[PDB]
Curated annotation (Swiss-Prot), chain D:
Residue window of the full protein shown: 27 to 62 of 1273
Record: glycosylation sites: 35
Effect annotated for changing residue 26 to H: In strain: Omicron/EG.5.1
Subunit relationships: Binds to host ACE2. RBD also interacts with the N-linked glycan on 'Asn-90' of ACE2. Cleavage of S generates a polybasic C-terminal sequence on S1 that binds to host Neuropilin-1 (NRP1) and Neuropilin-2 (NRP2) receptors. Interacts with host integrin alpha-5/beta-1 (ITGA5:ITGB1) and with ACE2 in complex with integrin alpha-5/beta-1 (ITGA5:ITGB1). May interact via cytoplasmic c-terminus with M protein. May interact (via N-terminus) with host bilirubin and biliverdin, thereby preventing antibody binding to the SARS-CoV-2 spike NTD via an allosteric mechanism.
Function text: Attaches the virion to the cell membrane by interacting with host receptor, initiating the infection. The major receptor is host ACE2. When S2/S2' has been cleaved, binding to the receptor triggers direct fusion at the cell membrane. When S2/S2' has not been cleaved, binding to the receptor results in internalization of the virus by endocytosis using host TFRC and GRM2 and leading to fusion of the virion membrane with the host endosomal membrane. Alternatively, may use NRP1/NRP2 and integrin as entry receptors.
Name under which the protein is recorded: Spike protein S1
């Protein structure tokens, strides 16, 4: 994907200033998942 | 066209037509490749 | 036509000049007057380059623009970057910091106290968006 | 006498910079594999 | 009520812009009413 | 039928003087308000 | 297609009409997107 991939690039930039990606550019933000990927593993490990 | 003539040379001429193209911009903004959309059914697929 | 000198109500010549406005790939040749201001970097500001207006943070960029190319665009078909009309310098435009605001509160029956969540923003900016510097000290406590 | 003008004749459609993107446009170009 | 000129009458209306419409009198976009105009040449047009 | 075309470019434009002229009976713009015109910058302006 | 352009381009009385076109359309697009998501989300939740 064009936009989504572009968004990921946004996360990459340390140097850029005033870079709040949530904004993409037009109000489209991505909320993070409640259960973090690390956490998801623990469930599965437990489930395992 | 009398008298002496210049050394061997060849030049070509072709005609432009309104066609659609998909241009590939590299990281630099350099156009590496392209697809003639109308050229063939395979090329049309690339277009969509 | 003829346009009888004195006679025409409808009959008189209306010299009509029509201005057609064309914008192209190219840089603007005809532009509005006076106001080349000092460019400021790394700060949320409103900007107008050759009529292109928007808000964002202007930072020096490392894009390899070709000498002909005036400016670039993102996938969005929105201005990714511009080069100053005054100085041949390349600037990437990143829109100024913003994000959702959510209030984390316990039940109102329980208490009035609250905690505010600023979505996807570094803590540094909270004073910036707010313009905490302007506000009264009562407000400032919240900033940081 | 004709020769195969395989791919040539592509040029930047506009003055606008773009990077790492596949963009489609319509202009007058040399159709691929046309006789020259 | 006004003294406006004949060609001007068009301007007393919602969207318009013009000399009177800008500086002299401004009807709102939302205007709810009527504009009644009748030329009174007799009342106020003296020689000179 | 013969209508003349003139090309205008490479300058700065003061259109407000044109707008603030009593001299023009009709000054209608489709797309620009006559005011705020000073804010625009264009590649080529053609006058007929 | 640009809001800032329209704002810079037209006075409010006229601009309101043009912007309105975008709002009805854009909102409708957004409306379209949401409906798709709800349906799609249902499919995923069905899978969940």
């Amino acid at each position: 994907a064009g936009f989504i991939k572009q968004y990921g690039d946004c996360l990459g930039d340390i140097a850029a200033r005033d870079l709040i990606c949530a904004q993409k550019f037009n109000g489209l933000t991505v909320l993070p998942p409640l259960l973090t990927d690390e956490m998801i593993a623990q469930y599965t490990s437990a489930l395992l | 066209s009398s008298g002496w003539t210049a050394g061997a040379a060849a030049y070509y001429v072709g005609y432009l037509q309104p066609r659609t193209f998909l241009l590939k911009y590299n990281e630099n903004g350099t156009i590496t490749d392209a697809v003639d959309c109308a050229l063939d059914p395979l090329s049309e697929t690339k277009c969509t | 036509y003829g346009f009888q000198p004195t006679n025409g109500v409808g009959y008189q010549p209306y010299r009509v000049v029509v201005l057609s406005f064309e914008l192209l790939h190219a840089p603007a040749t005809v532009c509005g007057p006076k106001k080349s201001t000092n460019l400021v970097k790394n700060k949320c500001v409103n900007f107008n380059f050759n009529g292109l207006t928007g808000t964002g943070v202007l930072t020096e960029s490392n894009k390899k623009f070709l000498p002909f190319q005036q400016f670039g665009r993102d996938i969005a078909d929105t201005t990714d970057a511009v080069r100053d009309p005054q100085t041949l310098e390349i600037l990437d435009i990143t829109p100024c910091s913003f994000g959702g605001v959510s209030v984390i509160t316990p039940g109102t029956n329980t208490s009035n106290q609250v905690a505010v969540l600023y979505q996807g923003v570094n803590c540094t900016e909270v004073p910036v968006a707010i313009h905490a510097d302007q506000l009264t000290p009562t407000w400032r406590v919240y900033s940081t | 006498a004709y020769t195969n003008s395989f791919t040539r004749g592509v040029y930047y459609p506009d003055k606008v910079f773009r990077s790492s993107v596949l963009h489609s446009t319509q202009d007058l170009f040399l159709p691929f594999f046309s006789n020259v | 009520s006004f003294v406006i000129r004949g060609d001007e009458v068009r301007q007393i209306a919602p969207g318009q812009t013009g000399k009177i419409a800008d500086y002299n009198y401004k009807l709102p976009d939302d205007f709810t009413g009527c504009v009644i105009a009748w030329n009174s040449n007799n009342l106020d047009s003296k020689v000179g | 039928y013969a209508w003349n075309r003139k090309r205008i470019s490479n300058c700065v434009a003061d259109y407000s003087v044109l707008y603030n002229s009593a001299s023009f009976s009709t000054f209608k713009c489709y797309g620009v308000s006559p005011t705020k015109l000073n804010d625009l910058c264009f590649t080529n302006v053609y006058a007929d | 297609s640009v809001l800032n352009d329209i704002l810079s381009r037209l006075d409010p009385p006229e601009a309101e009409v043009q912007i309105d076109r975008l709002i009805t359309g854009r909102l409708q697009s957004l409306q379209t997107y949401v409906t798709q998501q709800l349906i799609r989300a249902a499919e995923i939740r069905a899978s969940a």
